[PDB]
């Protein structure tokens, strides 16, 4: 529920409705019709794919790493660049997100048009 | 390509009816899409990039571009068995058909990896048990395994160099250089090439466990994916990459923090070789020099000479690294530095890109002698045991180091007991091994 | 009743079956290959052959990075008819290890007007993934008027940089030899000549000395008018010197391979050219694995078991190099690279991921060219030397039993080890070879020594045996007066002889003399002996077998101890 910066979060989704094929590992968040929206309080990633853990399990799993922001000397040595602040990634495993030291994670999932289920998290020291 | 039954089992002649195509006998489908090789004038699509699907498949080395390419045909088991057996090998890359509503088929401009997709066959039965057309097929999935990377040891010793790796004048003491000479009495006013330990480039072996690359269950396999393995050294907020593995072996320099966008300028260690024909584990032997590390001001004690990694014979900094070290700082490895290996799995259990990491920490430990007993009869056998971790440079082999590191100190004489000692010394002990 | 013929491939399975649980040195073990694709005749025996283009696939084994024909990519090969001329290395050059004799310039004139299209005979080039064989596809013209003499082939983008990784400088390395193996039997030429070309420009088309002077020298002769198309010859030091004999940048100069032959006036549809480079040896102390290298490629000529049997049978031989033969080029040149029972060199106890693995491509039943491979470990053993008794009398006929399977270098011949008799060399009166290099672990040529009172037993010889001791009689004269003809190890004729063809245990013996001459000091060569002899009774007789490769595969000094009893 609570994360720090330069941390990785495992996102799990239990969506039996999207298990379209038993012999095919189904995916969500790939298209604009079925989007996955991960977001902080200032940064977000669009069209983030999520992958089923099993071929016929109905559970989708993926992780995103919070890269933080480069405008801080966390180590205290006197130079920036302690965290490679970069927002990128569209697959299920290569998501990179920038996050302030005081921020909040938000993951939103859509199962039908004009309907969205969301999840929340917070960022502290 | 002209006939609507292209890449389908059957005959070229085909008529369109209410039950499909007359000439269509058996089809194989990935993600409910017929697997066909790009051909004709409808395969000009290039997709998100400028490379055509057929050219992409040719570059990937996949000669199984379609059912016809594999030569898959149905053959009866016997003269009158009535059971037909056919087979083919699943390619790693396939070209998806954009639309099946036109002949010849219009193919997509980019290929996709078949892992995770469901492979389905469809045998068109002209006469069912009641004697009419019934569509029957079977379903299966193209499995894939998550990649994993492992390192031999949790910790590794700090590598050391020789006198020839420093531009400083000859001295009887290291003077802060990365030199490992004998105890002072073994040196005569100047440390030369005959009175120091050989180069201490530790050889780390990287191992991955990816069953996907084990295409041959009882044959040689090699990880041919380009730049799938990244070897790097990190010291806090700064990072340096040793090189890349998986692509063809090539000459290159050392990049710092991945700043060099062009990947062809990075050193390549070649393709990893499978340890055993039925193991699926690939091992690559790579040696790390004492200079292959992030720049720091603590290493200015040695005016380091950097061995060239490119084709030039110069000893300058730019010969080994993409950029010169900062003024007042030199590339090196300190105690506590973290050694990490990066491997990008082209297909995990979900059949996509995945990054796995393993980490090791550089460390230096004290040395302590030991003996089987305290008292010894003159002329007896002394089992001189040295226990010290940092001399284990390679875990796959047992190295040897000069006995001159130990010294004799007694009322009789003071000598290093080795070849650098006094006349007649080394003969007196008769080391076994030397 | 009609009957049909079905065309279908099969899945192969190459297996290596050792006669026991360990593949020790000097043990020929069968290699079994079951492949129905190569059984193309049900009424005869099909033997694999590199020289036969019909035999498409041959199993291969390689170690290190040998310089094959395709190290620089896909080569380009052409054929040419004409005369070499007087300013050519093929005619003037000869094998004499001389710079002028073996290194020069290559010139030619081309007269291809009578040929088809009046152009040089180009060809289609293909390379096998494991045997590395080059298959040349061209027009199968066999007319009587056809006459071709030359053949020039370029190794793609290969340069001196791609050659120096395998070819080493024999003058600078402590131990190093270069070998050239070629197979041109498919050409059917009466005489074969091969030369190495180096130039900073393109090889095709070729140039002449009278035309341009860009390169000071561009020809290095290797083979001159050999009557055998199959040959595994040791390259002379001149070739190694010429490889490093140019001051220009090695990456800026390309390499080319030249052919001159006669009696080849007919060319088949497919022709095969196989000629690689071999290299073995070590540098400086040679204890670490980084300085040990053995670059070679081995191809097995499997022979069909029966007329209609898909099982092809072969065998593999391997010799584990020791401290005695590491400095002799004959043991490296004595192996067979291309034969039904080939042999190869092993420099280190290759186990686990580095174990000797044989590779063989195959067309499976599905139709893919999947490879099948097998490997067998070739570890080392810790040599153990001991004496039959704890104590010995005068002339008790002591016998030395050495059990170490790595010294067996042939399962056919009886392996023996003589004793060195040469005062100049530092290994005088020691088992081994006259050649000896000084390293951190002692002497390279020192295999086994016998010591009384921890002093090596050697016969007085040379100019350092003039000492007379407390009396006026020299040690050699004193021994002669005493009637002791066993003045040293060499005098007794003590040599190591293997118990059997492949036992791996060596037995040697000698009689303990009553009087022996003590060596005053071992710090000089030849040894300086004491002026008086002393009776060996009561002294401890100790042997020392120098083990080049221990169980972990490195040098460990092991010996045994005994005393000369007296009553």
Residue numbers in the entry:
A (entry chain C): 1374 to 1498
B (entry chain B): 868 to 1301
C (entry chain A): 446 to 1012
Provide the publication's sentences verbatim.
Our goal was to solve the structure of the N. maritimus S-layer directly from whole cells. Using subtomogram averaging, we mapped the locations of the S-layer repeating units on the cell, which were arranged in a hexagonal array. As a result, we produced a high-resolution map of the N. maritimus S-layer hexamer from intact cells. The central region of the S-layer hexamer in the map had a resolution of 3.3 Å, with the resolution decaying to around 4.5 Å towards the periphery. The first eight domains were well resolved in our 3.3–4.5-Å-resolution subtomogram averaging map. By contrast, the last two domains appeared less ordered, with the local resolution decaying towards the C terminus of NmSLP, away from the centre of the S-layer hexamer. Each monomer of NmSLP in the S-layer adopts a rough ‘cashew’ shape, facilitating several interactions around the hexamer of NmSLP. Domain 4, nestled within domain 3 and linked by short connectors, is slightly raised relative to the base of the cashew-shaped Ig-array of NmSLP, projecting towards the extracellular milieu.
N. maritimus, like most archaeal cells, is encased by a paracrystalline, proteinaceous surface layer or S-layer. The structure shows that the S-layer is pseudohexagonal and consists of the repeated interactions of the Nmar_1547 (hereafter, NmSLP) S-layer protein. At the sequence level, NmSLP is arranged into ten immunoglobulin-like (Ig-like) domains. Collectively, our structural data reveal that the S-layer of N. maritimus functions as a multichannel exchanger for ammonium ions, featuring negatively charged residues that line several pores in the S-layer.
